[PDB]
Ligand binder design. Structure first.
Ligand SMILES: *[P@](C)(=O)O[C@@H](C)C(C)(C)C
Length: 212
């Protein structure tokens, strides 16, 4: 099987049970709330909630943020199948995951993303699905930049004839002419600074407004 599309939780090898705690909180969120928009994915999704941009752009939309740092596609898939889509009927689900899929080919990662969209199409058939492209990373040109680009190309091709699945490239051009990414946009060449989130969230918020 494609390991990217075989649903599995993150095994606790540290001992504090943080991953399961987050999942359980999100499950409780879905049990208690009636969101119109559900965001799910990795640290890029999660930290969007920690910015002041969230309360100004996305809170008004009645949204839940189920991002978990370190998640790969198969982890998001497991979470969606194991409680996080229960007791809700969102209009839109936003998916952003795949940059952490180390050891998976771009094709496998694409397969994991397609599996996520399919599951959402089954459990929440009324919802439109928005998939964000994987952002570049690393200070200089490197294999992960090519990988994420290739995933974006493949995912975009997969979603193009899917008329309630929407591929969104939120990258305003973080990779400059000299091939570098500024630490002002990504403080560690992966996570987005407040300045980095600005054009990304603006792009997303715009799309969400059109669909909604
Ligand atoms: P995001 C891209 O999930 O950040 C990850 C790699 C951690 C630093 C492990 C949370």
């Amino acid at each position: 099987e494609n390991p990217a599309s075989k649903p599995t939780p993150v095994q606790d090898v540290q001992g504090d049970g943080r991953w399961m705690s987050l999942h359980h909180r999100f499950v409780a969120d879905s049990k208690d709330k009636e969101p119109e928009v559900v965001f799910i994915g990795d640290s890029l999704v999660q930290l969007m909630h920690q910015s002041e941009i969230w309360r100004e752009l996305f809170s008004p939309l009645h949204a839940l943020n189920f991002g978990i740092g370190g998640d790969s596609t198969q982890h998001v898939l497991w979470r969606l199948e194991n409680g996080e889509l229960e007791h809700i009927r969102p209009k839109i689900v936003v998916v952003w995951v795949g940059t952490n899929n180390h050891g998976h080919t771009a094709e496998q990662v694409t397969g994991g993303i397609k599996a996520i969209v399919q599951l959402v199409n089954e459990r929440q058939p009324q919802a439109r699905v928005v998939v964000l492209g994987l952002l570049p990373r690393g200070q200089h040109p490197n294999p992960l930049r090519e990988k994420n680009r290739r995933v974006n190309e493949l995912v975009r091709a997969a979603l193009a004839g899917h008329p309630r699945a929407h591929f969104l490239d939120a990258d305003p051009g973080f990779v400059h002419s000299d091939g570098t990414i500024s630490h002002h946009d990504m403080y560690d060449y992966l996570h987005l600074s407040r300045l980095g989130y600005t054009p990304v969230c603006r792009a997303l918020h715009s799309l969400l407004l059109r669909l909604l």
